Amino acid sequence: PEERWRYIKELES
Amino acid sequence: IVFAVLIAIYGVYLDQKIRSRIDGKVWQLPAAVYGRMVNLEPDMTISKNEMVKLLEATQYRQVSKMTRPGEFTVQANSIEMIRRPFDFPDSKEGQVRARLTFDGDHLATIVNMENNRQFGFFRLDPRLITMISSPNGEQRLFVPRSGFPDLLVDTLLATEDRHTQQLVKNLFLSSYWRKANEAYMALIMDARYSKDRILELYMNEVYLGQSGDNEIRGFPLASLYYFGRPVEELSLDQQALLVGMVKGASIYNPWRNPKLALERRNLVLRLLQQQQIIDQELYDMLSARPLQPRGGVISPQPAFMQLVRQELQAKLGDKVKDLSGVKIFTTFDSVAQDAAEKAAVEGIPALKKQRKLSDLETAIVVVDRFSGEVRAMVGGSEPQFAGYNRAMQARRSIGSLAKPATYLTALSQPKIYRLNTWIADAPIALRQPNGQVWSPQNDDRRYSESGRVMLVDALTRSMNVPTVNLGMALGLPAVTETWIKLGVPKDQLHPVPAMLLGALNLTPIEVAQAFQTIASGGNRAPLSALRSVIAEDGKVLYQSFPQAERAVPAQAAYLTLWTMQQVVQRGTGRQLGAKYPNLHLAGKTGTTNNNVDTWFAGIDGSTVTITWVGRDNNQPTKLYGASGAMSIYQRYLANQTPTPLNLVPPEDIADMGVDYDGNFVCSGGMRILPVWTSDPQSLCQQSEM
């Protein structure tokens, strides 16, 4: 799902 | 069918062996040694830039935006941080998002960002300095299931099981026939234990590296060793390598072979990018990120740990290493230690190149002015590899740094000795047994025109002849009694006239205690490195309490510190008073015959800092006066933010005016001096002549 990958972008940026 | 009975009864013995280790003491966990715990309050004298270095020294990271704990961001007049969780002794605490806001040279507010409400006080987690060496050589840091991030668990399971088999291997087995034993004992515990507990024991047991002759194993201790941050705050790129090193710890080591270890992280990032958990949108970001710490560490802080190790069995007994999961809370200050280590690393070659010296060494010791808590300790010129600790082991002559003890003894007699009492300054010749006459000389080999100087100026200028005339008028046991009250070793005191001008061999930590007793206003505080010692179950083993023992009168100590402010402004230490006048620093210089040893005892509002500069073979340093030891202290004052010494005069202190002839005046005068009096009407007794 896209709810897992989107959270990881703002966590690693 | 007898084989079914043998394997069934064997499984009960395996089940009994697993239950014995897992239900009780699993491993002999070594003692974690933490630094100081800094509380923050409104109107606290700390700047924004001073807080940045405190945070970076406590393993925090300056970032654009905060995501995981142990991170912060700087603004024009504020810092936003996520205070990491830490099981403190007074209360357990979680993550806390807060803004520290500054006005000028003070912390105005501390506001929780989740509720937009102030904090009366805010705790800062202590830095984990090191682990105490174990006999077996299996160094670990226990972290329960709650402490590991869920992405690190997903990265592990994706590359191993993907629903434990290698947990049983490293538990009780060694190095084809016993693979069936590994398979039987794995299924026995997997069924008789929780799904969460199997990840907890595995993540603390796995081998990830080596540090000399001790095995660093488990994700928590490995994270701090390889990256300088806990397991909770690992970035997915750092998690991939730490998970990747589980199969080849030694072969994928970044110190021995960086190129080989770099390929493993990208390989593990592909195993998770191919699966659901990650996509190609961020592979370019994580594949570019290189791995941070430089060459690991075998023994961090060897000098300070000597005092911690000495104090541990001296307070709790050697019956302590047997206990597992001990928590040692020390008084260590990372800001001051980092400031002192640079001042010693940079300051030594700066003196060797300027004065053309072959070798030169140093030792610095910082302690709390009121509590005597040891904040920092440098015991060498290069603390990269330090076997010898000069701050504790090198016992040298204190020299002129012995002069304040004589003036303290004098100024404790208000009714006879004051700051305006005259001391003679003319040729001296003191006869002694065996054998020649002792004729002491000033550094100048000069005497005063009037044949006298007032007490205050003799200490300010470190005048040898008047110190002998004063010291011998009081008597050598009266001066030696003050050294005992100041907290120095009694076995090192030899009460002869040489003692008055520095015939006294002390180490920097013993000098630290003497000046600390003065710094507090005559209250001896036994120097300590430990704050508390806690067990694995939260029960306290040792806990410090205040031990401020009234050594000398507060008024005597005050006038001696007031005179030590004149030493640094206009006297022997005039160099430092011109650099840092706003601190109003109190201190004393130390020089021996032929400058074999040089010193400086520097007191600020918050601490006492003793610094020694000399050679290991007891030879002339070829350095002018105490400028060698003062330049190292200047570098320490420069490297961190000192606290201004604004002395608060105790009761019975009267600022009195004296004429050129050194007598008190009723109205007016031409030199103001603090003087220990309840009724300042001595002026009447002087003016009726």
Short mmCIF file of N, CA and C in Angstrom, two decimals, chain B residues 7-98:
data_model
loop_
_atom_site.label_atom_id
_atom_site.label_comp_id
_atom_site.label_asym_id
_atom_site.label_seq_id
_atom_site.Cartn_x
_atom_site.Cartn_y
_atom_site.Cartn_z
N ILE B 7 14.11 -39.84 21.91
CA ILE B 7 14.01 -38.44 21.46
C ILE B 7 13.01 -37.63 22.30
N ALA B 8 11.95 -38.27 22.84
CA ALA B 8 10.94 -37.60 23.66
C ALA B 8 11.52 -37.21 25.02
N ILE B 9 12.22 -38.14 25.69
CA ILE B 9 12.85 -37.89 27.00
C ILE B 9 14.04 -36.91 26.84
N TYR B 10 14.72 -36.92 25.67
CA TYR B 10 15.83 -36.01 25.39
C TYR B 10 15.32 -34.56 25.31
N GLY B 11 14.17 -34.36 24.66
CA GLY B 11 13.53 -33.06 24.53
C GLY B 11 13.17 -32.40 25.85
N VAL B 12 12.86 -33.22 26.88
CA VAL B 12 12.54 -32.72 28.23
C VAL B 12 13.83 -32.15 28.86
N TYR B 13 14.99 -32.78 28.62
CA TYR B 13 16.28 -32.29 29.12
C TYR B 13 16.69 -31.01 28.39
N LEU B 14 16.36 -30.89 27.08
CA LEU B 14 16.62 -29.68 26.31
C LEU B 14 15.70 -28.56 26.80
N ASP B 15 14.41 -28.89 27.04
CA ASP B 15 13.41 -27.94 27.57
C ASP B 15 13.82 -27.44 28.97
N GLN B 16 14.40 -28.33 29.80
CA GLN B 16 14.87 -27.96 31.14
C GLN B 16 16.10 -27.04 31.04
N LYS B 17 16.97 -27.26 30.03
CA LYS B 17 18.17 -26.45 29.81
C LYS B 17 17.82 -25.06 29.26
N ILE B 18 16.79 -24.96 28.39
CA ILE B 18 16.35 -23.67 27.83
C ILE B 18 15.66 -22.85 28.93
N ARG B 19 14.73 -23.48 29.68
CA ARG B 19 14.00 -22.83 30.77
C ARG B 19 14.93 -22.29 31.86
N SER B 20 16.05 -22.98 32.16
CA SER B 20 16.99 -22.53 33.19
C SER B 20 17.69 -21.21 32.83
N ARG B 21 18.18 -21.08 31.58
CA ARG B 21 18.87 -19.86 31.14
C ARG B 21 17.90 -18.72 30.84
N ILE B 22 16.84 -18.99 30.06
CA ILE B 22 15.88 -17.96 29.65
C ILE B 22 15.03 -17.45 30.83
N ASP B 23 14.57 -18.34 31.74
CA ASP B 23 13.79 -17.90 32.91
C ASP B 23 14.77 -17.61 34.06
N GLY B 24 15.40 -16.44 33.98
CA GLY B 24 16.38 -15.98 34.95
C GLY B 24 17.47 -15.16 34.30
N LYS B 25 18.73 -15.30 34.78
CA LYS B 25 19.86 -14.57 34.19
C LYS B 25 20.21 -15.17 32.83
N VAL B 26 19.97 -14.42 31.74
CA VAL B 26 20.25 -14.88 30.38
C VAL B 26 21.75 -14.71 30.13
N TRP B 27 22.24 -13.46 30.13
CA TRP B 27 23.66 -13.15 29.94
C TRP B 27 24.19 -12.35 31.13
N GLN B 28 25.52 -12.29 31.27
CA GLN B 28 26.19 -11.48 32.29
C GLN B 28 26.40 -10.12 31.61
N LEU B 29 25.39 -9.25 31.70
CA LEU B 29 25.41 -7.94 31.04
C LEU B 29 26.38 -6.97 31.74
N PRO B 30 27.34 -6.35 31.01
CA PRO B 30 28.28 -5.43 31.67
C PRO B 30 27.66 -4.12 32.13
N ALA B 31 28.37 -3.42 33.03
CA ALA B 31 27.90 -2.17 33.61
C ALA B 31 28.05 -0.98 32.67
N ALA B 32 26.93 -0.32 32.32
CA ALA B 32 26.94 0.84 31.44
C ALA B 32 27.30 2.09 32.24
N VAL B 33 28.33 2.84 31.78
CA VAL B 33 28.80 4.05 32.45
C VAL B 33 28.32 5.29 31.69
N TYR B 34 27.38 6.04 32.29
CA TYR B 34 26.81 7.25 31.70
C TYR B 34 27.45 8.49 32.29
N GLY B 35 27.28 9.62 31.61
CA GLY B 35 27.79 10.91 32.05
C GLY B 35 26.82 11.62 32.95
N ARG B 36 26.95 12.95 33.05
CA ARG B 36 26.07 13.76 33.89
C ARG B 36 24.69 13.93 33.25
N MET B 37 23.71 14.28 34.08
CA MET B 37 22.32 14.52 33.69
C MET B 37 22.08 16.01 33.86
N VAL B 38 21.94 16.75 32.75
CA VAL B 38 21.78 18.21 32.80
C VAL B 38 20.30 18.61 32.77
N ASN B 39 19.79 19.20 33.87
CA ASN B 39 18.42 19.71 33.92
C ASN B 39 18.45 21.14 33.36
N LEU B 40 17.36 21.56 32.71
CA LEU B 40 17.25 22.88 32.11
C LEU B 40 16.03 23.58 32.70
N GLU B 41 16.17 24.85 33.10
CA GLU B 41 15.10 25.62 33.75
C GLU B 41 14.97 27.03 33.16
N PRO B 42 13.81 27.71 33.34
CA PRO B 42 13.70 29.10 32.87
C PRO B 42 14.70 30.03 33.56
N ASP B 43 15.16 31.07 32.85
CA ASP B 43 16.15 32.05 33.34
C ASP B 43 17.50 31.38 33.71
N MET B 44 17.84 30.26 33.04
CA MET B 44 19.10 29.55 33.26
C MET B 44 20.15 30.24 32.40
N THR B 45 21.35 30.46 32.94
CA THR B 45 22.42 31.13 32.20
C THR B 45 23.11 30.15 31.24
N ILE B 46 22.49 29.97 30.07
CA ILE B 46 23.00 29.15 28.97
C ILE B 46 22.55 29.83 27.67
N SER B 47 23.44 29.94 26.69
CA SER B 47 23.12 30.56 25.41
C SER B 47 22.62 29.50 24.43
N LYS B 48 22.19 29.94 23.25
CA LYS B 48 21.72 29.05 22.19
C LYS B 48 22.89 28.22 21.66
N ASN B 49 24.00 28.90 21.33
CA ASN B 49 25.21 28.25 20.81
C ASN B 49 25.84 27.29 21.82
N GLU B 50 25.74 27.61 23.12
CA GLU B 50 26.25 26.76 24.20
C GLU B 50 25.39 25.49 24.31
N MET B 51 24.06 25.63 24.11
CA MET B 51 23.12 24.50 24.12
C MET B 51 23.36 23.58 22.91
N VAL B 52 23.75 24.14 21.74
CA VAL B 52 24.01 23.37 20.52
C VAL B 52 25.16 22.40 20.76
N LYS B 53 26.27 22.89 21.32
CA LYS B 53 27.43 22.06 21.62
C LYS B 53 27.11 21.04 22.72
N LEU B 54 26.24 21.39 23.69
CA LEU B 54 25.82 20.45 24.74
C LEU B 54 25.06 19.29 24.10
N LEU B 55 24.12 19.61 23.19
CA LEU B 55 23.32 18.60 22.49
C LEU B 55 24.19 17.71 21.60
N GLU B 56 25.04 18.31 20.76
CA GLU B 56 25.95 17.55 19.89
C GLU B 56 26.92 16.66 20.70
N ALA B 57 27.32 17.11 21.90
CA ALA B 57 28.20 16.33 22.79
C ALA B 57 27.42 15.17 23.44
N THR B 58 26.09 15.33 23.61
CA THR B 58 25.19 14.31 24.15
C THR B 58 24.59 13.41 23.02
N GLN B 59 25.28 13.32 21.85
CA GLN B 59 24.92 12.50 20.69
C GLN B 59 23.63 12.93 19.99
N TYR B 60 23.35 14.24 19.91
CA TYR B 60 22.21 14.76 19.15
C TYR B 60 22.73 15.20 17.79
N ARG B 61 21.84 15.29 16.80
CA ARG B 61 22.22 15.62 15.42
C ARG B 61 21.45 16.82 14.89
N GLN B 62 22.17 17.86 14.41
CA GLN B 62 21.54 19.06 13.85
C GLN B 62 20.99 18.68 12.48
N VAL B 63 19.68 18.86 12.27
CA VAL B 63 18.99 18.47 11.04
C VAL B 63 18.08 19.59 10.52
N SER B 64 17.60 19.42 9.27
CA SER B 64 16.68 20.37 8.63
C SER B 64 15.30 20.23 9.28
N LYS B 65 14.83 18.97 9.45
CA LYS B 65 13.57 18.64 10.10
C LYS B 65 13.75 17.41 11.01
N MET B 66 13.00 17.37 12.12
CA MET B 66 13.09 16.29 13.12
C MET B 66 12.11 15.17 12.77
N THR B 67 12.59 13.92 12.75
CA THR B 67 11.80 12.74 12.41
C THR B 67 11.86 11.71 13.55
N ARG B 68 13.08 11.24 13.87
CA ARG B 68 13.33 10.28 14.95
C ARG B 68 13.86 11.06 16.16
N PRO B 69 13.93 10.45 17.37
CA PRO B 69 14.50 11.18 18.51
C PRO B 69 16.00 11.45 18.36
N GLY B 70 16.56 12.18 19.31
CA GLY B 70 17.97 12.55 19.28
C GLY B 70 18.31 13.47 18.12
N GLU B 71 17.38 14.38 17.78
CA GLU B 71 17.53 15.33 16.68
C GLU B 71 17.05 16.71 17.12
N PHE B 72 17.59 17.76 16.48
CA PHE B 72 17.21 19.14 16.79
C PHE B 72 17.47 20.08 15.62
N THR B 73 16.89 21.29 15.67
CA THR B 73 17.04 22.31 14.63
C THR B 73 17.27 23.67 15.29
N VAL B 74 18.18 24.48 14.73
CA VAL B 74 18.52 25.82 15.25
C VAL B 74 17.72 26.90 14.50
N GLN B 75 17.28 27.94 15.24
CA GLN B 75 16.58 29.11 14.70
C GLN B 75 17.33 30.35 15.17
N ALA B 76 16.90 31.55 14.74
CA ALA B 76 17.53 32.82 15.12
C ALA B 76 17.71 32.98 16.63
N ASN B 77 16.68 32.60 17.43
CA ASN B 77 16.70 32.73 18.89
C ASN B 77 16.04 31.54 19.61
N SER B 78 16.08 30.32 19.01
CA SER B 78 15.49 29.13 19.63
C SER B 78 16.01 27.82 19.04
N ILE B 79 15.87 26.72 19.80
CA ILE B 79 16.25 25.37 19.38
C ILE B 79 15.05 24.48 19.58
N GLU B 80 14.72 23.67 18.57
CA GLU B 80 13.62 22.71 18.65
C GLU B 80 14.27 21.35 18.67
N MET B 81 13.96 20.52 19.67
CA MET B 81 14.55 19.18 19.80
C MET B 81 13.52 18.13 20.14
N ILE B 82 13.89 16.84 19.96
CA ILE B 82 13.10 15.68 20.38
C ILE B 82 13.99 15.01 21.41
N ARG B 83 13.71 15.23 22.70
CA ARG B 83 14.50 14.67 23.78
C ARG B 83 14.25 13.16 23.81
N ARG B 84 15.30 12.36 23.56
CA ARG B 84 15.18 10.90 23.47
C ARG B 84 14.72 10.25 24.77
N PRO B 85 14.13 9.04 24.71
CA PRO B 85 13.71 8.39 25.96
C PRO B 85 14.90 7.91 26.77
N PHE B 86 14.75 7.87 28.09
CA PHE B 86 15.81 7.39 28.96
C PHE B 86 15.23 7.03 30.31
N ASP B 87 15.57 5.84 30.82
CA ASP B 87 15.08 5.41 32.13
C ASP B 87 15.93 6.10 33.19
N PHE B 88 15.53 7.33 33.60
CA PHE B 88 16.25 8.10 34.62
C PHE B 88 16.01 7.47 36.01
N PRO B 89 16.85 7.76 37.03
CA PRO B 89 16.62 7.16 38.36
C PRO B 89 15.37 7.68 39.07
N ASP B 90 15.06 8.99 38.92
CA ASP B 90 13.91 9.61 39.58
C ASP B 90 12.60 9.25 38.89
N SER B 91 12.58 9.16 37.55
CA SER B 91 11.36 8.82 36.81
C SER B 91 11.68 8.37 35.38
N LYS B 92 10.99 7.33 34.89
CA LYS B 92 11.17 6.84 33.51
C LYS B 92 10.52 7.86 32.58
N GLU B 93 11.11 8.10 31.39
CA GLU B 93 10.57 9.09 30.45
C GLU B 93 10.62 8.63 29.00
N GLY B 94 9.62 9.07 28.24
CA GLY B 94 9.49 8.76 26.82
C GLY B 94 10.14 9.83 25.96
N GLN B 95 9.71 9.93 24.70
CA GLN B 95 10.19 10.94 23.77
C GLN B 95 9.50 12.26 24.13
N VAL B 96 10.20 13.41 24.01
CA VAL B 96 9.60 14.72 24.29
C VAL B 96 10.03 15.77 23.27
N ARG B 97 9.09 16.26 22.46
CA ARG B 97 9.33 17.32 21.48
C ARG B 97 9.21 18.65 22.21
N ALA B 98 10.30 19.45 22.24
CA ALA B 98 10.31 20.71 22.98
C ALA B 98 11.10 21.80 22.29
#
